[model samples]
Structures are given as structure tokens and as C-alpha cells.
Target: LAAGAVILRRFAFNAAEQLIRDINDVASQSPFRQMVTPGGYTMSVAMTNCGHLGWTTHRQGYLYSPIDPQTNKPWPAMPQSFHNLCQRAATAAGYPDFQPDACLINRYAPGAKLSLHQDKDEPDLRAPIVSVSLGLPAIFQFGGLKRNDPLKRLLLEHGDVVVWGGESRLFYHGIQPLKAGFHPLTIDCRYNLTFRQAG
Candidate 1:
């Protein structure tokens, strides 16, 4: 909260119920799945993506692709509201004109976790990342560049938005295993919409 950048909380970009419904609709279109990492291990969190390029993983490596391997078709286009929200948030954070071509949708159920990793798949590391959290809450590990760097465990609740830029653009960050929680809207799942400038 004491950061130098503009931090907007609960910006009212969308109604809670509508947002949840929209996310569910998008998921129906794209269908979240547990993708296998390059190491041959499947990720605990189920994920999907929208926009021109979707964040995908294969035996070769993790990269953006125009087609969803599961459906063998282009991933669903990002919802209009989702697109506008990111642009407005980024503009307020002093990063304007952020046309994110890659929107990664991550679903974290109870016991699902994401390891600390840097988002280096994008070609432009200078662009800021606009992330939104919804449904059940989770502990987000925000760490520095080094793998062993001191980390900050921040709790991200539903409708929370996080925008990171400048020196923090390429920092290592991840979410801890989600504890069990029941939300009327999302049932037993949490949704994360991370908008990135991935060409």
C-alpha cells in the first residue's frame, strides 16, 4: 500500500456477480485445463487464456500460441470488459496504451499452488502487468529478482487488482496453495486474470 505507483482498489470496474458470470462464460468458451509443464509435470492450478495469444506450455517450452492445444482452435477472445479493465488500471498506474495481446486465466482450487517464477515469456519486459483476483482469497508471494530473495506475502482477496511495473516488472512472484473456501459465485475456485504485453 505504501508503494510509489498508483494503487487503485475495488475500482468498480465490474459488478461482482456479473464479473463472476463473465469469467464462467469465458471459461466455458476456452475451458481451463491442467497443462503439463516442460518438465513433464502437470501444474496443480487449472489454466486457460484469451486474446490474440494464449499462454501455453508443451514439451518444447512455455510460450504464447494462437491455438489451444486441447481444442485445436484459437483460444477465445478476451472479454471486452476484461480488456477495458486492464487498460484503465494500467493507465492509472502510469502505463498507458497497454493493449495486452495475452490474457492468462488461472484457476486455483483448494491445495493448488504456483511456484515462484518470473514472467519472462513476453518479449517486452518493460511493460507493466495488470492482474486481477476474484472468488476465494489467496496468499501472493511477491519476491525480488533473485530466487532466494526476501519475499512479501500479500493477501489478495476477491476483486483485488495488482499492477506492477518499473523495477518490479520481471520480479519472481507466485501464489501459495489455496485453502478451502466456498464462494457462492465461483463455488470452490478462485480466478486470476493476468494481462500482459506478450507479442
Candidate 2:
């Protein structure tokens, strides 16, 4: 494990192709959109979601809701393949019972980045976060409990999965500014799918 996170290198390589296709199917309905952070800054990444819950951000704040704010309907159902992948990844990382009800899909363009922050909005903190990376590569910043704590940079390539739970679940984490690159599968963007048990 690197920096307290389980790194599954190319664990989903075989499934990457089908997963990208499935992701487009979901995006066709709930299309990705740039979200506004509570701080009034526009996010660099475009995001959407599936499953019973969807993660949302606005000038108000970040929260998980059953319906999409834009469509005023429930987010698309979580693809069975996605669910299976998350469960398998989580189990291999030591969190066998992880059942995610929210799958946050993020599209990162060149120069896009996510600031270090902890995932604490969920009601159940026991479930580990199962995150999959596809398309372009990016440097993930995984830090300790405190915001100013030391950080470790991990290069996440396509089909790589990172699972963090237990004491590492609340650790600060984010992605560095993406470097420009073209991936055959996703063109010039990096795609990330994060599964969480948010209610």
C-alpha cells in the first residue's frame, strides 16, 4: 500500500473498454456539467453520477441527493458492471461489505485539478472509497488527517484503482493539475469514477 491507500495497478484493465462505453450511456442522460463550489469558484472538472444517490455541488454546498438538480429526476441506475467492479476492488482492499449507493463520475480536462479535501458528507463513514481511473493519467495527492500534513503523490494510470478505508478514509486527497495529453479511449480527458456509500 502506498501512503496508506491500496493501489491496484491496472486491476480493471480488461474492463476499461466496456466501462467507458457504459459511462457514456449514463452521461447521455445526466450529462456532465461544471459544478460551483460553495466558495463561489467554478470547478475545473465536469461531473455527473449514477445509483440511488448523486453527489452535487453548488453555491450552497456539496451534498448527496436522490435526484439530479438539473433533470429533477433520479440519477440513472448504477450499472451492474460498475457495482461489481467496486465490490471486487473494495473486498480486495479489505472492505468486503462496501455497497456504494453513489457513484460520482468526473471528467477532467487538461489543467483541471481538485484541491485537497476529505470526504465527510456521507452519513456512513465506515465504507471505503473505491475510485477508478481511466483515460489519461494524473497525479493523486494523498495526505494525512490534517490539511497541512505531508502528502504523497501517486501517479494513477488508466484502469488503476485506489481504495481507502478505515483510518485512511477521512484523509485529505485530491488530484494535481492534469497535464495535457490525448488518450485513445477518452480523447484528451481523464475520467474518474468514485464509489461511495452516501445516503
Candidate 3:
């Protein structure tokens, strides 16, 4: 965590079950898919989204689509539990006015990873990003806005929440490859839910 990023460990522990249920329902509607970047690299982590705006990618590149490109329908509505946790974590991290319209759910199987990258697609960069982790644990590499900046490796576990905003809104971050293991609840994968105020 940095001056602009705060970690609230186990912030959502009490609601983990509801969160998983919501994630399952959201996936039921939109489903998760491995997306290809404009550069033509297929992502290892599979993803899906809910809420008013969902981030996605295609042969054309990244998009903030109101409709799921896979289903041609609006992404499933954001679950109240998800929204509640997002707002609470943001405020606890000091963004009292934060309100997110997008929640991206990234699923990682063992050995899957996400390369370091900055998030900048949202029109409103003023709002912080609220990320909740669940299922298997993974090491999160969070660095400064510059790609070359020193990185801090943080272990993310189920029910942990991280909020990055203010000057760190565009900080580069990613997940290391997941270790081979099985979690009693999620079996053999991790799920990361990132909420952003994108529209």
C-alpha cells in the first residue's frame, strides 16, 4: 500500500459467502472469458463484470461496454452486497464520496497471471478503485505510476480489500502466477473483484 493506497484486511470476511453467490449469478448471465489485448496477447486470467458499466476486451481492444459483448445484453445488475462492500471499503480508505458503477471480476486458475499494467480507461479518475479479493491467495505487485518504480509485493487473501486512489489511481499493478493449491471454498482458483467509477 502507498500514500494513496490502503489495505483493509478481512474487511469483507463476514460477507464472503454472499459475495460468492453474487459472483456466481453474475457469471451465470455474462460468463467469464479470457480476453485478448490489442497487442494480440491472450490473457491468462478469465474475467466478467456486473453493474452499469463493465470493462471488457475483444479483437478490437478494451472497451467499457454497457452490454456484454458475449451476450449482447446489459451486464447483470450489481449485487447489493457487492456495492455495499465497495462503498464501505472506499470510505474506510478515505474516499468518503466514492461511488462505483463498475465491478470487474477476474478469475485466476493455478499458474494464471496478470502482467503489470495501469488502469486508465475510466473517464473519472478522481474516484478510487476498490478491490476485494476472495478464494485462493495470490501475491499482488503494486508499483508507482511509472512502470519502473519499485514494487511492493502484498499477499492478498480471501476477504481482503484494497483501495487505491488519489495520486495512485493510475499506479501500475498486477498479480503473480497463482500457486498450485486448493481452497476449501473455491476449489483451485482465486477471484478478484475490482470496483471502479466508470460509466
Candidate 4:
């Protein structure tokens, strides 16, 4: 945690039920896939996106696109439930005006992990990235601007929301490989909705 980061403990707990439905709706439309990075490595996390723009990665680059390559159509619209929860989390984090045009949904199965990376594609650099956690718990690791900066960790549980922006907008962060677990709602995976102002 830094000057611009906040962890709203269990803030989204009540919304998880409806949010899971919304996530399924969006994924049904676009479908989740493991993306290939420019380095030719396939990401362990399965992902899908909704909203005006969607983040993408392939052999060529990491970029955002208005269309889903798999469907050859615009990604599904950001669900109203998603917007409501995200806005509430942002507002509670002192970013009341936050309105993300992109929502990257990630599903991590056992052993899937996200390496340290910064969320920087958004032109609205001051707008915070709000992450809603569900299903399973994870170790969230973050460091300063440098990749080697000493890391700090947090045990993020279902329904917890993390928001970081302003001075901490470009900080490096990622999730440790997910340990095998079962939740009544999701069975054997963890879900994350990362809302960003990426247009």
C-alpha cells in the first residue's frame, strides 16, 4: 500500500453473487482465452473482456482493441452490475468520478499466475485501476516503479477490492500462482475483474 493505493476489505462481498452472473454473461459472449505474449509465451491466466475497449496480447504486441479477435465482433458491453460495483469501489477509494471503459476479466485455475506488470495502456493515467476479487484467495504482490523494487504482499480474499492510481498508477504488481482450491460459487478457480479507463 502506498499514497495512492487502497484495499477496501470485503467491500464487494454482497455483490459477488450478482457479479458472478454478470461475469458469466460477458464470458459467454466473448469467451475466455489464454493469450500469447510478444515473447511467445502463452499466459497462464484465461481471460475475457467487456466494455468499450479490451486489452489484448499476441506475438506482435500488447495492445487494446475495440473488437474481439475470436468473435470478430465488439466485445460484450460492460455489465451494469460491474459498473455499479466498480464505481462504488473507486468512489470509496477517493476516485469518485472513475468510469472505466475497459474491464479485463481473468480466471485463474490452479497453478496459473500473473507475473509482475504495470497497467499503463490507459491514457487516463490518473484514473485508478480497480480490481474486484472473487472465488479463491491469492497473494497479491506489488512493488515500486522498478521491477526489482522490494515487494509487499497482501492476502486478497473473495469480495475484496483493490484500487491504485495517481502516484502508484504505474507500479509493478501481479498475483502469485494460485493454489488449488474450491469455492462453493466457482468450484475450482478464481475470478478477477480489473476495471481500467483504457480508451
Candidate 5:
């Protein structure tokens, strides 16, 4: 893409299954649950986290916190495998020094959609955001700076990774409503891991 976004096709193919398995293990310790928006609306996707920071949303607002409100404990540490993959993906995408402190894991079932939004909650905007897709497929909605700007729909499949930074770091991006499908690993859901430097 011309917007400084690099799509690394099947970048993690060999480790996809193992990664999903590890993610599920992490989820068992820190269960996934839908979060509520500040406006009081429930999100369609269930979310969890790993690493030093975890992204969360509630009636107060969206922010990264070190502790999980549900568990009242620190979120699970980022798996060494997950951390390694993020660094590799970032380097492959032109960011050779991305040390992500947060990995937001999102699980979406059929009919779940994320509206256009920018990942601006992080204090540092220079680090590129690396997103890894697993299980089913999704249509990634990448838009310009403005919310109403023209958008591009890109299909992201299992093991695909997308990295965006520089001029495209704050661009509006989201996922369209996931269609009904079955994946061997995830069954009827799609899993996404968004790695960010959120210090």
C-alpha cells in the first residue's frame, strides 16, 4: 500500500498453529471478554492481553493499563514466541527496532465488526503497529486520516501480518463484519493479535 502499510503475506505461516495454541493457553489464564465502550455500548469482539501493558475499554474510556480489572492482577506476560514474531514482523515492515510492550488479542465471531478507529491511545506514535491474523479471514478497512475519507478493503488471511507506521500510523483502520466461516484452529471465530509499543 502507498500509505506506509506493509502486508506480509503468510509471514508467520510455519508458526501459526503453534502461536494460536499458545494464545489459547494465555487466554485460559486471562480469559477473553467483551469490553464496554465509554458510551456504555458493549463491543462485539472479546479481548485479552499479554505483555507489560494491555489495552482496555470501559465506561471511563479506552486506555492501556498494567492490571486487568477483571482479574485484579497483571496481564499474562507476552509469550517469548509472540514477542519474537512481533519484532521480526516489524523489521520486515521497515521498522527494525520495534519493541512492543503490549499485545492486544481480539477474538471475533460471525457478525462481529470493528468500526473505523485509529490506534492513538499509545503514548508513542512512532512505533509501527503490527497486527497478526489467525484462523478465519477478514476484510481490513484501511482509511485515511479523516474518518470519512475513502477507504481500501484488503483481505487478510491466516498467518498474514500487517504493519503500519510513519504517515500511516494514525490512519483509521478496522475490520468489517466477519462472515460465517469455520477454521480448524478457531472453529467459527477469527483471532487477531495487535502488537504495539505502549509505554
Candidate 6:
């Protein structure tokens, strides 16, 4: 957790259930769906967005577009509370003045997983990614710029935050297929909130 920062600890995010409830409400309006990669592969995780810009990809290309291809409408407005939390978290991580243009919410049920990849949809890599986890715990894989590098696996639980940027901005990271487990909050799901500066 020094130069290459990957902190895993319990941090009270304040009314996290209320935050999840708000997010679930927004997601209900937006609906979470697995998206296709530019390479034509379908992502394993179900996702939705709430912000000024939403990250998307298809046969066309990979980029953040204002309109949701599913509904042809702009993503739901980012809740002020969610936005404030991200700003505070990023600032606490030493990257102040961070205003994310996009907030991607990924939901993972048991056995669902995220492949190792870089968060490259955003144009400004200078702004760190402040990822928050809730509901259930999972194995987080942190690798190097390349996939082959020795990876570090850490357990991330509810209210866990991981910020990766600067020299480690392009490092590869992912979540292992979630094993069957039930949390009182999620029942059997893990909610991942990833904030990115898409502008």
C-alpha cells in the first residue's frame, strides 16, 4: 500500500444502505445489463450508470457517450450524495478537486466475474478511479500493466474502497468469480460503484 496503492480496510461510508437504496432506485429506472466489448465479447458483469457521461462500447468503438444505447436517453442524473462521497473519497486519497463525470455501477451475483482489464474508457487518466464495494465480499485481483505479472489477491468487503491512479493508473485489475454466499444486505449480490472522470 505504498507507491502502488491498494488499501483494503473497513471504512464507514455513512448510511451505505441508504446509498445503496438510492442507487437501486436509480438502477431500477436505468436497468443493469451486461454490455458488449468493442471486440464483440459480452462482459460477464451486469452494469448500469448514473452520471453526466456513461461508459459504453459496441461494434462501433469504446468511449463514454452521453446517450444510453439501450434507451437512447441520457443516463440518470448522478445523485448529489453519491457525487459528494466520491469527491470526499478521492480527496482523502490525496487527489483533490476530483469531479467524476461518470459513475458506473456493476452488480455481480454468485459466479459472476470481471476479467482483468484497465479502466481506459476515460480520457483523463490523471483522475484516479475511486471504487467502492458493498453488499458482499469478493477477491480483488491487482496485476501489473501486463496480465502476466504476479498478481495480488485481496479480499474486499462491504464499505471497502480502492483507488488506483498516477503511475498505477494503467495497471490491470479485476474481480474473481464470486463464490456462493449471502449477505444480509445483498442476499447474494455484490454492488461495485466505480467513479471515473470521463470528460
lDDT of each: 0.83, 0.90, 0.90, 0.90, 0.89, 0.81
Please identify model 4 stretches exceeding 4 Å from their true place. Answer: none
Residue pairs in candidate 1 whose N, alpha carbon or C atoms collide under 3 angstroms: none
- Per-residue C-alpha lDDT of model 5 across residues 47-90, encoded as one tens digit per residue: 99999999997448988899999999999999978988988988
Candidate 6 residue-pair clash tally: 0
- For each candidate, what TM-score against the reference? 0.93, 0.96, 0.96, 0.97, 0.97, 0.93
Q: Write candidate 3's Cα lDDT for 28-69 as tens digits.
A: 999999988898889999999999999988558787889898
**2 or 6, which is superior by TM-score?**
2
For model 1, residues 1-199, the per-residue Cα lDDT tens digits are: 3233344666633555776676778788889899888888889999989889999996569988999988898988888788778888888888887789988989998999999999888898878788888889899887777898888888888777888787677778899999998987788988888898888
Better of 4 and 5 by lDDT: 4
Per-model clash counts, in order, read 0, 0, 0, 0, 0, 0
Off by over 4 Å in 2: 1-4
lDDT of 2 by residue, 124-163 (tens): 8877889999999999987788998889888999999989
lDDT of model 4 at position 179: 94
Give the poorly placed runs of model 6, Cα more than 4 Å off.
2-8
Better of 1 and 4 by lDDT: 4
Q: Give the per-residue Cα lDDT of candidate 4 at 103.
A: 95
